[PDB]
Design a protein around this ligand. Structure first.
Ligand SMILES: [Cs+]
Ligand SMILES: [Cs+]
Ligand SMILES: [Cs+]
Ligand SMILES: [Cs+]
Ligand SMILES: [Cs+]
Ligand SMILES: [Cs+]
Lengths: 106, 106
């Protein structure tokens, strides 16, 4: 299981969420991006470790506020996947909102 | 342009997506089904109206969560095509996964 496979599942969810709620502006994207991330983080420890081993994600947090102060190592790793997803989905936000708007024409 | 012509294009895409990623289980089909649907929805208003006029699709949604709360009528119609595609492709999921698995023999 790789970070690229997890990111593809999150990107597809956000695409769906955009259509289901007719989202047109980045200022209304926060919750859709975070649900997509939540729905894409792996659940099994083994998949979480495999994702951390693959291309596209490092161990350091960008914002330490999204890092839990906890002794549970697996939660720290899950929180890091969750954070990278949200960052990468935000970089595709404008592109995705344009593709949605542009998919019909009279 | 008819719903049957749109569905044929989506069915063929999902068939391709199954081969390209060696998909073997329905629990791994979600994203392939939704991409196929997305790629098959018509873009021109006229084709969207012609599809709604043809055999195989009604105006009511099965899950209202897939219906956007919006004043844009054309988006509501597109969302209904998208939903019917996903429903009909899910009814063919097992059949398609069996045809893929069964296409080779030693
Ligand atoms: Cs890595
Ligand atoms: Cs914290
Ligand atoms: Cs991008
Ligand atoms: Cs009809
Ligand atoms: Cs909705
Ligand atoms: Cs069927």
């Amino acid at each position: 299981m790789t970070y690229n496979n997890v990111f593809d599942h999150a990107y597809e969810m956000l695409k769906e969420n955009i259509r289901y709620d007719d989202i047109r502006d980045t200022d209304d994207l926060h919750d859709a991006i975070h649900m997509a991330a939540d729905n894409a983080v792996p659940h099994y420890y083994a998949d979480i470790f495999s994702v951390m081993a693959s291309e596209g994600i490092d161990l350091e947090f960008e914002d330490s506020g999204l890092m839990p102060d906890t002794k549970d190592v697996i939660r720290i790793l899950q929180a890091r996947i969750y954070e990278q997803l949200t960052i990468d989905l935000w970089e595709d936000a404008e592109d995705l909102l344009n593709e949605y708007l542009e998919e019909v024409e009279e």
